[PDB]
Structure formats: C-alpha cells, structure tokens
Amino acid sequence: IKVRENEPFDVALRRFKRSCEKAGVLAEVRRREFYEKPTTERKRAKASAVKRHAKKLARENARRT
Amino acid sequence: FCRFTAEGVQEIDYKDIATLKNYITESGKIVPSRITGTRAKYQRQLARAIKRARYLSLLPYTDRH
Amino acid sequence: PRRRVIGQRKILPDPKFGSELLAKFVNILMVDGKKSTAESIVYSALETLAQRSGKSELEAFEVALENVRPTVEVKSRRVGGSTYQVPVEVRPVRRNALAMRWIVEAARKRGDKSMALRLANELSDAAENKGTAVKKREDVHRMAEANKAFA
Amino acid sequence: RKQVSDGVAHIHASFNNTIVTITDRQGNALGWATAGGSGFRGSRKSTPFAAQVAAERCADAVKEYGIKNLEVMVKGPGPGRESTIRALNAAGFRITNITDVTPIPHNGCRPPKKRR
RNA sequence: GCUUGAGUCUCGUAGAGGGGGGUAGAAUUCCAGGUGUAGCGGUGAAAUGCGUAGAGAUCUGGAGGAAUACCGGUGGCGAAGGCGGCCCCCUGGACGAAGACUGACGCUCAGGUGCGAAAGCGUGGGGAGCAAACAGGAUUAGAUACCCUGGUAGUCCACGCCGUAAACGAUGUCGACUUGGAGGUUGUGCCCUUGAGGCGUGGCUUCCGGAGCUAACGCGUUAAGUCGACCGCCUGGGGAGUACGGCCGCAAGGUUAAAACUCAAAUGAAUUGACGGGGGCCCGCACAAGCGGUGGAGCAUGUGGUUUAAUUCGAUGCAACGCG
RNA sequence: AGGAGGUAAAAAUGUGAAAA
C-alpha cells in the first residue's frame, strides 16, 4: 500500500493486500457487532483454531507410516 | 521464545521512539505479542507508552496525515 | 461423468483417400445412418466446393473451414454466486470440430434445391468468409469481449 | 482548461459503482466516473470491470487536459482490485504513488446489523 | 494464657476496580467556496428515495458527539452486574519470602437496608450516525415477516422510582484432606550471574483422565470425590410462578402465593434406523457438450368420466394405463 | 503445515382407532 518501487513499478507486488485488507478485514469489520457477538465467535472459532495448534501435537495415530 | 525482561530484568519506555517504531509495525499499528515474541504486560504497559506517543503525536493514529 | 476417459473414435471416410479429417464432415453430413446416400452427395458436395473456391481437395476445405474456424467459446460457471459465466479458449480438438458443426447446420436451409445443391451454397459461401456457417461463427465471436467478466 | 500537469486520482470505490473524482494536488476535478453512468445494469453493474471502464472514463475525456504523473488514491472496498487501477495505468500516464489509502476508523458512531 | 484460626504493620507486584473532570485524532454527518458530471442507491432480484436547484464526489476550514480498528489474551478487579484512548483527584481489595503483635475478636444468618446490565416513566438536555410504531417499493397465497431508504422514543448525562434474567462454570458460603501431566499470568527462593539458565514454592483458569460418585452425559485439586457447620429451595405435570388480600411502587407491576379442575402423563441422557433447502468422498447419462422421438396431424390401441340394459370384473404414481 | 476473501431466494398439509 505504501509502495513506490521508485522508477520500475512494472510488477504489482500485491501481497500486503489480502491478509491485511480488501477482502479480509473488509468482510469482518463493518456491521454485525452487538459488542459481544465476537465473544460468541472468538470463543467458538479460536478454540477451534487453538485445537488446530494442538491436533498436530497429538500426531501419533493409526497411520503406521 | 526470545530473551526479554523475564529473568534478566529491564525497563521499556516511550522516549526511544525508534525502538518504539519496532513494537508497532510499519504503519503505526501495534502488532500483537503473539507474532513479535514479546510478552503481554511487557506490551500492555508499553501499549500506554504507544498511545502516550499517539497522544503526543509521535507514532500515529494512521498513515494518512 | 467423473474419472475415466477413452481415446479417439474410429469413423470410415470417403472412398478415394483415407481422410478422418474430411470424414468428420462426412459422418456429420451422414444423415440417418446412411453413409451410402451421403457418399453420392458428399462427393458432389465436394465437387462444388473445391474448384469454385479455387483449390483442389487437399486445401480447398480450409478455405471454407479456417474461415468458419472459431477462436472463442463461452460457458456459464458459478462457484456459488449470481449464476455468471467463466469462459476459456477451446483447444484444437474441439475448435475446428465446432467449425464443422456450423456447416452442417447451414446445410439444411436455403431450400429450392437438392441436399447436394444445398451444400453447394454454403461451402461456396464459407470459402470467402461470407458464409452463413461463418455468420454463426461471427455470432460466437461476439459472445466474447464483453461476457468475460469472471475468470 | 489550463492543461493540469500533476493530478491526484481519487478512486472513491465501492463493490458496484464508484464516484471516481479525478483531482489534482489542489483537489479540483473536471473528470469523473461512475460504473452506473457507463451502465451494464443489473448484476453486471456489480463489477470492477465496470469500474475499469469507469477508470477508462478516467482514461478518456481528459486527454484534452493531459493529466500527467498522478497519485492513485483509491478509497473504499471492491473484491476485484486488479481491474480498476491498471486501466488508469493504461491511459499512458504515470502513477507517481500507488496508494490504497482508506479512512480507517476508531469506531466512533454506531453501526446497524444485517444478513438475515 | 498458648497457637496452627481471623486480623494489623514493615518491604514489593498489577490492571477496564469504582465515581467525577479535563483533553486528542481518524471515520462519518450538515454546510459555504473553486473544479465538474448525468446519473446516485440497493439486494436473492427489483424498486423506493435522490439528482440539472447543479447531488454522490476532492481539498482547505468552521460547527458536533459518543464508542475506542490494531495493541487486547478462557488475561485483571470485584459481591454480582459490569467496566477497557491518555492523564489527574479521592480511594479500594487481594498475594508472597522473612518476622513482631492482640491472643479464637471464628462461620452463617430469615426480618431489615443498599446496589444491580436492560427497558419504561417524571423534569431539562446530547441529538451526528443507527433505530419499535409508520409510509412507499419487491418477493408473496395474506407479508400486517426476513430485505432497502428516511424517521418518534431510545442508545449518552443529572436526581429518584420499578428491584426484574439463560444474573449460565445453570454447581451458595467457609475450612481441611485427596496420584498428576501440558500452557498462559504476576510474585519468588537456594546455586556458578559465570546465555533466553538446574531444581522447587502459592493464587486465578483451559484440556485429558485414575481413586470415588452418577440415571447417563460426565465432575475430577475452582470436583457432582471424603466429612462437619448455617441459611435458602422441592413434594406428579399442566392450571401459574395466575387470582383475593397485604408491604411497596405516581405509572408499568414486583413479591409472599393457592384452589377448583383434567390427565395417567410430564421431564432428562442414551441406543438403532429415518430426516435436513448440512458436508466430504464415490457411483448412475443427475447435469454440462449432441442426434432423433412424445406433445400440433391421419391411423392402431387401453382406461377413466359419461350415457345406457350391462356398455364383465379388478387394478387406480409406479413397477394397471398396446394390462389380464 | 500457520491463516484470510467469495458460500445458499421458491417446495406446504399429512389435523383421525393399523402389532406377542
């Protein structure tokens, strides 16, 4: 976003776009707030995501590989 | 997993705005401690010192000024 | 519908030279399973095309085939959306096969003649890119350049 | 006319339409755009390919004034952000700064609720 | 009198603890001025509304207010609710290595009192954005629903009133005992500080489970486990947390709280199939990419309805309908 | 691996006595 690439700007260098803005937070910051509906959503989704941290730490299973 | 003021205790302030340019990312945004390795009360104390520069107009609200 | 694909199919060309290329016209010019009645006609349909457009039967067909040869095709694809279209350029296998589709499609109309002499009109028409089969080839060209909004 | 040399392009964008205002370092804007003034009415009005033609309305009707080296300053949303900007690049101009500067808030006034 | 009970003090730690007041920027809203253009808007789709008065829109500037994107985490404080931009004023409770001191001042507690998110009301305001009732416009069997654009009260502030929840870890309060392992957070001790270190010692919590317990799911050091103490609650569901009266409340009602009456149920976990306009994978011409038939017409045939003496009888999505 | 954007509008009633 703060990119000039002074004389050659022939390639876009669009990697500060997606994980920062233009779809990511822009589909999550505007409406549907209630001040604590995120606490009905952070407690569901991050707990579904911090177990995605933990399920690789319980990795030994019926693979046998 | 880095070394800090855990067992080799130190202080962190607001005046050193160049190092306080590191505990925000390059827009003025305070990155969480989760990525930069630091600790919560070593950031929550510093979060006031971030805003004490933002109250004193040194590290911004936004990159449009 | 899902996994396995066979290779090529095997049709039987005209009795002067082995030509699977020209047979694809002929087998689609084959109406009602009748190779025979086509064999009387598709030679006469090739009698009128070649020496009135200019070339012999090697390259006189692409006078009336490369001019009706498309370059763009469109189809509707949604990933879950507003029922929109995601188009692609088609490969050589289907492209000029679609060019042969318009010519038999133009073969039916313009009726005061025989099937032999109805094929005389459009093959002579498609030779100089003034074909009614080419007219349908010019309609498929305008289904690009504005209807490619999703990719 | 004055043939304004330095311009500042405010692509005041949304998903469907955009009132692009082709300003300068002053702010004065003789050129404009909408994706609705071009048209493609209906579902196809919700396209930044139409904002591209709106940015092509920012790429014509001003060749008389010659809007040289410019700051792309796009505000607002739009999920097709590789369509609206490069048509302004296709004008033959130069983009001095490629900025997606948006008025990002601190949540001062209340938002309503939707998607039911 | 003593001390392991409770508490006080010295030396340190922490933050949205609570009440009030100053003060900043971005976002957005209205408007003046320069430039300028025919569209702006919204959704599953569309329209409403608005714009030629020169809107949406860019920059400078004036006039506003509350919430604080990221920092910010099952982390912190507290009786609960609840409370996070920064600072200031008053003030609050808790934890710990190491000690002194009063010397069981300990625990709970109906009545009574105060507080309590939220909405409502009375007096005067903030009044920008959003927003019950309302109008117009689509979908629609009605839409008096979901949806869109404006907009009354409200959301914010001062003093009182109502004193109510899913106030939910649905688990009251206090104390003791009772394998643990993996992290977050603030303290912190002995040792060589000889690098983000080796090994212990408390509190607040998330996850898996042995002993034990349970109807089951499951709780598991904050236990539904092992015991003792005080207060409160329950006696089949529904009727009803309604009514007469009483305390209180301007109002809206809260609270204590039945009965007649009806049924033989009501309620909860789990088991196996079924169902979803839930999903992944796989298959069938289900579909995408094609040619020709059925449906318009002549002819050949069966049933139903009908008429009639019966127009044998049965079948009546199908897989009965060129069937017997 | 660690994490984000796009993700659903039309189809209702079976109101009643079918098991050792």
Curated annotation (Swiss-Prot), chain D:
Keywords: Ribonucleoprotein, Ribosomal protein, RNA-binding, rRNA-binding. The keyword RNA-binding applies. Gene3D superfamilies: Ribosomal protein S11. One of its GO terms (molecular function) is structural constituent of ribosome. The gene is rpsK. Belongs to the universal ribosomal protein uS11 family. One of its GO terms (biological process) is translation. HAMAP family: Ribosomal_uS11. PROSITE patterns: RIBOSOMAL_S11. GO terms for cellular component: ribonucleoprotein complex; ribosome. This is Small ribosomal subunit protein uS11. Located on the platform of the 30S subunit, it bridges several disparate RNA helices of the 16S rRNA. Forms part of the Shine-Dalgarno cleft in the 70S ribosome. InterPro entries: Ribosomal_uS11, Ribosomal_uS11_bac-type, Ribosomal_uS11_CS, Ribosomal_uS11_sf. Part of the 30S ribosomal subunit. Interacts with proteins S7 and S18. Binds to IF-3. It holds the Pfam family Ribosomal_S11. The keyword DNA repair does not apply.
